[PDB]
């Protein structure tokens, strides 16, 4: 671990000129603030505060002021404009102005739910994310246009992948930022891109996740493209969802690796599935917290629509990678990069770990393509259907009170509040699919 | 009633050059077929075949041939086809090859549930609608637009209102045709106008409805304008509702009249309220069948949001006009001019007179503004809420037995299938609302 | 008098075909509704109901429904709809669902405040108005631009006055709608037009005022010209003010002409001035009920700016024209055509009758040029300065609990309501004038 | 800004319905290497010289605004909802009040007024606030209560029971309050209060006489 004494030798050796003090509000939207190195020694004394009332979902105006205490192991110098003034950043968690951890800080909400796997004896909650994104041209006045960069397919090549050295430029800025990057490839739908990096422990992947979107949204705009993580920006082509690959660890042993059980899988792992597969209706308001992603959760675009699992199959809610061993993991296909990568782990760990204290006997793997089975056979197995909209997905969580509890209270309260606001916002609005279909006809 | 012999020689007296047999699909789309006075008999003798296969709501293509039997009492000439192409009109009911009348004919279903008030003593089922519409300008193309013939308000004057000379040439287009036009004027929302008339027998009022829709559609663009009966084409302005006044008649007496009361409303009337009010949540998917409809069903826009009633008050679902005389009526305002007239009367009768066959008791008339009630202050007075989406109001129809059987076995089967796939395109497409809200921020 | 029998009779004579039942809301905004001759008898029976809640200032929704009682003396055929659908108008009064009038009806309020002379003995209260209006060009698509039709001056000739045969035709439709037209001409500011008509009694001159604007607005937009009665649409030019020429009568004796006192004015005449002269600080929220009219009230454009009077002089708040006899009158110039004439009347009556039963020593004529006396010399006489804005006008009214009594309480409680939400609307807005002077300058 | 393509404005309210720009005024005095507001071991750590400074400004608030919000436009910012001080009051770590007390004290204790946009004349704003704020210590004035709730959510005549009145509504309204203030006037100068009260009245006059487009939009078509 890093101390306050080796941060002085990264401001002075690396010759940075600023430190960006970042964090994430409830909605998964990173917000940061920039200080001259002249103040470095004040932030590290934790004496730095902001307006809480304007961070969406934190605190009300009568007690606005709130504290910022930096995290030290998260230091990463910035490899873009570094001659102008080299930049640094330290991310962290927010305290209320009494030196108490804020309950609206999602990070702290993850570190609270992380202490519930030490009593159960687990040393790391590893996660590998695959945040799939799109790339759109920028118009003459730098305003993102409806045209995508390329018309490419899956795993395609020049001349049919215009973000070739564009993605390349992303991977390099990540490489400089201590990353260990797995693969770089175009994806199924036109303009769809994926860039794979190795898993880290729970809160360092969330860290390396919200870190990831900034490297792509700025660096794509140096190639003239606007990157987006909206789940289904285009109707009719593969939405871009952020697959969550998770594994539990126990003293250098992956607790999910046991080559005896039917699929070379362990018992703490089969148990973990049903931990999610019964409360999956619950958290698909957390893990899919946007009106748009309920357009991705519709069948046929290698996105999950029903609650089941299988080995190697890219139809169901859980897919078991044909590779195993230490790289053993459980892939959850419903999370999309419009989720909050902190609220996700707390909401999925508790949901998951709920199936180690009871373990609730997971079902049989639907080992077909689950897209094309009738309502007469979705019934036959008993596979729950996934929430139609956010309207339904919300009431399906205030009923799962193990998920409501992996959310604290503050974070739950401001959420069903906010997402019923957006959900009600959109239900009353007349957008022009209803004018075409009905105006000219009735 | 009209004769088969005084219509054949009703041509040589006005020189009628063509005849239009017309009927109604499952949606409210007045169909047609034009034929000369040449063929006058062959239609009168009900040997006018056609294809139900392509008409939405009728038989499949392996048994497609169907016949037209006119209802010779419905006879007018249009006052625009003058001496060149003088057009006659009837309205047909549908029958099979076996000449068994058709099992999905919407005008049969109403003609059929019209004698279920017969077996308990009622002369006529009175209906008088107040259908609002919106008026849009045109272009060089002679096609619709987004701007409305005037920016006006309730009752305003020319120049602030600009259909002033439109609706005049509209009404006295129906006035020739045989209507008792009560009022023409400009309703609340700009470009939205109301023309209403005196009540009529159930089939012959809704016979007179499809006349008013067509006639308004036609005389509108003769004056350069577009005539939409869309329920909610714009945001923030009053919807367009096809108001429902109705009343039951018995031996020269309005069965709702209570000659010398302080309520002037019989307990047979009072029972009809609970008749619908109870089944309200079940047949409103027929009172507002389009996905846009439910965006008009919201507070503030003089439109019912809650199942409740009050007197001389235009917030509650059922308004009680304080003019009674014989003109006594209960006015359900939860309809917009998209529902099928020959079937929202069936599915409003089959339920409302089940409030008398079962003799239920209507709740407290809540003579406050119902919108003003707190989220749960109206949870105490029991006034619950209308269905949210067409998806939610569709489930509620499939379950209600009362209105399901006042709808037909072939009409409910081929109406639930469409509105789900009509509801499904809506759920699966993405609308520009969402790139506006999600693209550049996630 | 005009009985219901002559008017049934009147119809079949001229071949009128529609009936227009009009009325004035709280603000001056003439509303109406159109019905055929077929319902003329449902009108005269006083059995036509309308919407109370969507007319501004009337009533709430919880008791929406209200009735319409025709006044049959106002009957005039609208001459501009020759032969096709002829029309004819009548000016109604409002009664509740209990056949009792509306305490908020602006016509019944004038009626009420008129009975206060019936007990102090006055036959008639004459009023002769001078509604000056502006004319603007139109666009190609029938939408009023900001150019004026002519750059003329006071009284100028063609062709320095494009609307010469606009006013000419304006006068003619009035000459067949029962008007005795006094004079036609051009006004001070370019594109301005004054057409005077001889006085009528209190509630007939108001009716003939509102009939004037319906006929100047309509006829002018038949000249490709938009007519406005804004008090000052342009800055820097003479506003348009609708002068009030009122006179009181006693037994064919104008109670103001008694050829003795200092200007052949009577005791009742001089006395009358006193009431308004002090009280004027309370009624220029009614007589000038619009922000744009306090831009009119600046000095130097023949508009009153301080409360004083003089003879033949156009500077002070009350001019007496040097003509007398039955031509004896008083002229208040504080009123602009942007006010409610009935409410203006109900307000200036109790504010002039109070100058009869106390009579309060009307001040001596300020026979100078009132714009050319400094603030030292305003304070010299003690001449009150007119209220600065609409906000300053409102609060200076609610202290006059005798002018609030000329309104009633339904009327007053709604008028201060709206003008407070409206005067609030402009106080908060950020309009172009402010960006100009402050953005590139600060 | 112009070296990097853009135009910079300090206009207090160049749009509608969004937060305005404002020159917060965090003030503190010093006494012989000492922060005159610090009471190292108080309950509020707020010296009874801080409180008397609080009263000083909060009493004269209504009348020295025309020196701190001199533009007609400044009063288009003094409205609720946009973190702008609308009523004369004070509380801690709360952004609704006129005077906000930020929680961190150390040696850096402050009471923060938020009713100044970067349009006022700082050389003269301080002269106004020292004069009339040390008028509450020299007069040992006692402050009104903290209202430690968000002030905008208080009823129309509610804040009258708790005694908190409101700030001037318009420049005219604010100017009268100054002309009737002698504490800040003599803390302002005789050549300055003379050339300043003649200067903003015409500037407020122009605003009053001219017709804005809002009046042609609203009233041309209907009226
Ligand atoms: N044992 C593991 N635990 C957690 N995450 C893992 C593990 N193995 C791989 N991952 C994650 O899987 C991601 C790679 O996904 P990808 O190659 O697209 O697999 P697939 O195509 O099968 O979905 C990497 O980002 C990595 O972090
Ligand atoms: N006895 C009755 N039965 C059915 N409908 C009636 C009866 N009496 C009046 N009506 C209807 O009331 C309606 C009145 O229209 P309108 O005056 O616009 O109503 P509203 O006051 O709700 O706007 C007419 O359409 C008429 O058909
Ligand atoms: N005795 C009277 N009572 C009421 N009004 C009168 C009387 N004599 C004249 N008037 C009014 O004076 C108006 C003439 O207006 P105008 O010629 O513009 O005079 P001025 O230029 O002084 O305003 C007429 O409209 C008429 O109604
Ligand atoms: C086959 S795909 O699986 C396409 C992903 C899809 N668009 C989705 O996320 O739903 N992605 P990957 O194999 O990299 O996990
Ligand atoms: C003034 S309104 O009252 C407006 C209600 C709205 N048009 C609706 O029914 O959606 N209806 P009506 O005048 O026909 O009674
Ligand atoms: C000379 S004027 O007097 C114009 C009045 C002024 N322009 C105004 O109303 O602002 N009107 P009139 O001669 O009819 O009395
Ligand atoms: C977040 S804000 O707190 C908003 C201030 C407000 N816009 C104003 O007008 O002063 N002010 P700051 O961060 O400068 O203390």
**Is residue A19 packed enough to be buried (19+ CB in 10 Å), middle (13-18) or exposed (0-12)?**
buried
β-strand pairing of A87-96 with A18-24: parallel
User: What separation in Å is there between the alpha carbon of C400 and the centre of ligand 6?
Assistant: 29
- Cα separation, C149 vs C241, in Å, equals 19
- Cα separation, D35 vs D107, in Å, equals 6
E strand residue ranges, C203-255: 225-228, 243-249
Q: How far is CA B10 from CA B43, B73, C295, in A?
A: 15, 12, 70
Query: Nearest CA to CA, how far is A65 from chain D (Å)?
Result: 5
Angle (CA) A332-A334-A337 rounded to 5° is: 105
Both structure tokens of B136: 């849009």
Q: How many other CB atoms are found less than 10 A from the CB of residue C189?
A: 22
| C288 in Cβ contact with C336 (< 8 Å) | yes
**Residue recorded with tokens 């919200």:** A210
**Is residue A344 packed enough to be buried (19+ CB in 10 Å), middle (13-18) or exposed (0-12)?**
buried
Return the SS3 of D30.
strand
Q: How far is CA C285 from CA A46, C56, C270, C392, in A?
A: 59, 18, 24, 9
- Cα separation, B369 vs B416, in Å, equals 34
- Cα separation, A378 vs A386, in Å, equals 11
Both structure tokens of C193: 């037009």
Within 6 A (CB) of ligand 5 lie: B 130, 132, 187-188, 194, 238-241, 243, 296, 302-303, 314, 333; C 51, 54
Per 3-state DSSP, chain C is made up of helix, strand and coil in percentages (nearest 5) of 35, 20, 45
Using a CB-CB cut-off of 8 Å, the residues of chain B touching C32 are 155, 157, 185
Binding residues of C for L-glutamate: 238-239, 296, 302, 314, 333
| B238 in Cβ contact with B188 (< 8 Å) | yes
Q: How far is CA A182 from CA A195, A198, A248, B206, in A?
A: 8, 6, 20, 68
- Cα separation, A60 vs A308, in Å, equals 41
Residues 6+ apart with CB under 8 A from A298: A305, B427, B428
Both structure tokens of C336: 């602009």
Partner-chain contact C35 B183, CB within 8 Å = yes
* Alpha carbon of residue A219 to chain centroid: 20
Q: Ligand 7, closest atom to CA A50?
A: 13
Render D62-81 in DSSP notation, one character per residue: GGSHHHHS-STGGGGT-STT
- Tell me which H or E stretch contains C183: strand C181-186
Query: Nearest CA to CA, how far is D159 from chain A (Å)?
Result: 16
Mark out the alpha helices in B222-367 (DSSP H runs): 267-287, 341-344, 346-352, 354-357
Residues 6+ apart with CB under 8 A from D39: D45, D46, D47, D48, D50
Q: How far is CA C183 from CA B423, C170, C193, in A?
A: 66, 12, 11
* Residues belonging to chain B: 442
- Cα separation, D204 vs D73, in Å, equals 10
B-chain residue closest to C218, CA distance: B159
Q: How far is CA C61 from CA B68, B301, B408, C52, in A?
A: 48, 11, 38, 7
CB-nearest partner of B181 from C36, C49, C61: C36
Angle (CA) D65-D69-D70 rounded to 5° is: 105
CA-nearest of C59, B426, C152, C254 to A427 is B426
Catalytic residue flag (residue B164): no
Return the SS3 of A181.
strand
User: What separation in Å is there between the alpha carbon of C313 and the centre of ligand 3?
Assistant: 14
Handedness of CA D202, D203, D208, D211 (dihedral sign): positive
- Tell me which H or E stretch contains A133: strand A133-138
Q: How many other CB atoms are found less than 10 A from the CB of residue A427?
A: 16
Residues 6+ apart with CB under 8 A from A198: A128, A180, A181, A182
C-chain residue closest to D77, CA distance: C428
Using a CB-CB cut-off of 8 Å, the residues of chain B touching C58 are none
CA-nearest of C163, C139, C143 to C151 is C163
Render B128-144 in DSSP notation, one character per residue: E--BEEEEE---TT---
Q: Is the peptide bond before B159 cis (omega within 30 degrees of 0)?
A: yes
Query: Nearest CA to CA, how far is A46 from chain D (Å)?
Result: 12
- Tell me which H or E stretch contains D54: helix D50-60
Using a CB-CB cut-off of 8 Å, the residues of chain A touching B391 are 388
* Residues belonging to chain C: 442
- Cα separation, C366 vs C368, in Å, equals 6
Q: How many CA atoms lie within 13 A of A427 on its CB side?
A: 19
**Is residue C149 packed enough to be buried (19+ CB in 10 Å), middle (13-18) or exposed (0-12)?**
buried
Resolution of the entry in angstroms? 3.5
Catalytic residue flag (residue B62): no
C-chain residue closest to D214, CA distance: C431
- Cα separation, C83 vs C339, in Å, equals 35
Using a CB-CB cut-off of 8 Å, the residues of chain B touching C18 are 168
What pairs with residue C310 in β-bridges? C319
| C47 in Cβ contact with C116 (< 8 Å) | no
Radius of gyration of chain D (CA): 19
Both structure tokens of B166: 């439109």
DSSP structural state of residue D203: H
DSSP structural state of residue A242: -
Terminal-to-terminal C-alpha distance of chain B: 68
Return the SS3 of C117.
helix
Residues 6+ apart with CB under 8 A from D11: C435, C438, C439, C442, D21, D73, D119
**Residue recorded with tokens 């400009």:** B186
Residues 6+ apart with CB under 8 A from D153: none
Return the SS3 of B207.
helix
- Cα separation, B113 vs B257, in Å, equals 23
Residues 6+ apart with CB under 8 A from D132: D56, D57, D59, D60, D64, D181, D183, D184, D187
Q: How far is CA A363 from CA A266, A274, C15, C272, in A?
A: 15, 7, 84, 96
Return the SS3 of C106.
helix
Both structure tokens of C21: 């039942």
Q: Ligand 3, closest atom to CA C128?
A: 27
Q: Is the peptide bond before A159 cis (omega within 30 degrees of 0)?
A: yes
Both structure tokens of A347: 């909401």
Residues of A with CB under 8 A from a CB of D: 47, 49, 51, 53-54, 60-65, 97
Give the CA diameter of chain B.
Answer: 73
Partner-chain contact C431 D214, CB within 8 Å = yes
Best residue among A153, A234, A237, A243 to mutate for probing ligand 4's pocket (most ligand atoms within 8 Å of CB) is: A243
- Cα separation, B304 vs B297, in Å, equals 6
Return the SS3 of C265.
strand
Both structure tokens of D163: 């005694």
Residues 6+ apart with CB under 8 A from C362: C270, C271, C272, C273, C274, C277, C309, C355
- Cα separation, D91 vs D151, in Å, equals 10
Query: Nearest CA to CA, how far is D218 from chain B (Å)?
Result: 13
| C356 in Cβ contact with C283 (< 8 Å) | no
Per 3-state DSSP, chain B is made up of helix, strand and coil in percentages (nearest 5) of 30, 15, 50
Terminal-to-terminal C-alpha distance of chain A: 69
**Residue recorded with tokens 């009268």:** D176
Q: Do chains A and C touch (3 or more CB pairs under 8 A)?
A: no
Q: Do chains D and C touch (3 or more CB pairs under 8 A)?
A: yes
| B322 in Cβ contact with B246 (< 8 Å) | no
- Tell me which H or E stretch contains C345: helix C341-357
Helix (DSSP H) and strand (DSSP E) numbers for chain B: 14, 16
Residue A95's φ and ψ, nearest 5 degrees, are -115, 145
Binding residues of D for L-glutamine: 20, 77, 83
B-chain residue closest to A27, CA distance: B442
Q: How many CA atoms lie within 13 A of B146 on its CB side?
A: 5
- Cα separation, A67 vs A51, in Å, equals 9
Cβ of D180 closer than 6 Å to ligand 7, yes or no, is no
β-strand pairing of B318-320 with B330-332: antiparallel
User: Which experimental method was this entry solved with?
Assistant: X-ray
Handedness of CA A150, A156, A159, A164 (dihedral sign): positive
DSSP structural state of residue B38: G
Give the CA dihedral B288, B289, B295, B300, nearest 10 degrees.
0
What pairs with residue C60 in β-bridges? none
Give the CA diameter of chain A.
Answer: 74
- Cα separation, A165 vs A193, in Å, equals 13
Partner-chain contact C432 D169, CB within 8 Å = no
Q: Ligand 3, closest atom to CA C328?
A: 1
Active centre residues of C (catalytic): 51, 130, 132, 187, 194, 243, 314, 331, 333
Both structure tokens of B212: 């008013």
**Residue recorded with tokens 């770089």:** A184
Residues 6+ apart with CB under 8 A from A423: A291, A389, A390, A391, A394
Mark out the alpha helices in B178-326 (DSSP H runs): 202-221, 267-287
| B435 in Cβ contact with A230 (< 8 Å) | yes
Q: How many other CB atoms are found less than 10 A from the CB of residue D156?
A: 6
Interface test with C, best of D75, D211, D222 (most C CBs within 10 A): D211
- Cα separation, A57 vs A105, in Å, equals 9
Phi-psi region of C57 (alpha: psi -120 to 50; beta: other; left: phi over 0): left
Interface test with B, best of D217, D218, D219, D222 (most B CBs within 10 A): D222
Buried b (16+ CB within 10 A) or exposed e, C208-243: bbbbbbbbbbbbbbebebbbbbbbbbbeebbbbbbb
Active centre residues of A (catalytic): 51, 130, 132, 187, 194, 243, 314, 331, 333
Return the SS3 of C57.
coil
Partner-chain contact B290 A337, CB within 8 Å = no
Best residue among A128, A182, A188, A322 to mutate for probing ligand 4's pocket (most ligand atoms within 8 Å of CB) is: A188
Using a CB-CB cut-off of 8 Å, the residues of chain D touching A61 are 83, 94-96, 150
Handedness of CA B179, B180, B183, B188 (dihedral sign): negative
β-strand pairing of B76-77 with D111-113: unpaired
């Amino acid at each position: 671990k890093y101390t306050k004494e080796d941060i002085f030798r990264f401001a002075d050796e690396q010759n940075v000129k600023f430190i960006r003090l970042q964090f994430t509000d409830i909605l998964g939207i990173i917000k940061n603030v920039e200080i001259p190195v002249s103040q470095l020694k004040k932030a590290l004394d934790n004496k730095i505060m902001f307006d809480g009332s304007s961070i969406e979902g934190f605190v009300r105006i009568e007690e606005s002021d709130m504290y910022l205490f930096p995290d030290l192991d998260t230091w990463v110098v910035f490899p873009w404009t570094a001659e102008k003034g080299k930049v640094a950043r330290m991310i962290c968690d927010i305290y209320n102005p009494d030196m108490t951890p804020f309950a609206g800080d999602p990070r702290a909400n993850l570190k609270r739910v992380l202490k519930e796997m030490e009593e159960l004896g687990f040393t790391e909650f590893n996660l590998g994310p695959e945040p799939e994104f799109f790339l759109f041209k920028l118009d003459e006045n730098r305003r993102p246009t409806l045209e995508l960069n390329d018309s490419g397919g899956y795993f395609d090549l020049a001349p049919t992948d215009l973000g070739e050295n564009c993605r390349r430029d992303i991977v390099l800025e990540l490489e400089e930022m201590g990353f260990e990057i797995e693969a770089s490839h175009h994806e199924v739908a036109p303009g769809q891109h994926e860039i794979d990096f190795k898993y880290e422990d729970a809160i360092t992947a969330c860290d390396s996740i919200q870190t990831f979107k900034l490297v792509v949204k700025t660096i794509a705009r140096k190639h003239g493209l606007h990157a987006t993580f909206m789940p289904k920006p285009l109707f009719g082509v593969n939405g871009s969802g952020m697959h969550f690959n998770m594994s539990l660890f126990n003293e250098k042993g992956n607790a999910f690796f046991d080559e005896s059980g039917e699929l070379e899988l362990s018992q703490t792992a089969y148990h973990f599935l049903a931990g999610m597969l019964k409360h999956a209706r619950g958290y698909t308001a957390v893990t899919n917290p946007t009106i748009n992603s309920f357009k991705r959760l519709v069948p046929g675009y290698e996105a999950p629509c029903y609650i089941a699992w299988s080995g190697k199959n890219r139809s169901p809610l859980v897919r078991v990678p044909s590779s195993r061993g230490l790289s053993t993991r459980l892939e959850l296909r419903s999370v999309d990069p419009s989720a909050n990568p902190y609220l996700a782990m707390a909401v999925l760990l508790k949901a998951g770990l709920s199936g180690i204290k009871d373990e609730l006997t997971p079902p049989a793997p639907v080992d077909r393509n689950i897209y094309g089975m009738n309502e007469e056979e979705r019934e036959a197995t008993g596979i729950y259907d996934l929430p139609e909209s956010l309207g339904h997905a919300l009431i399906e969580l205030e009923k799962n009170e193990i998920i409501k509890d992996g959310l604290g209270e503050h974070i739950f309260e401001h959420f069903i509040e906010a997402k019923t606001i957006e959900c009600d916002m959109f239900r009353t609005a007349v957008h022009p699919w209803e004018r075409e279909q009905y105006l000219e006809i009735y």
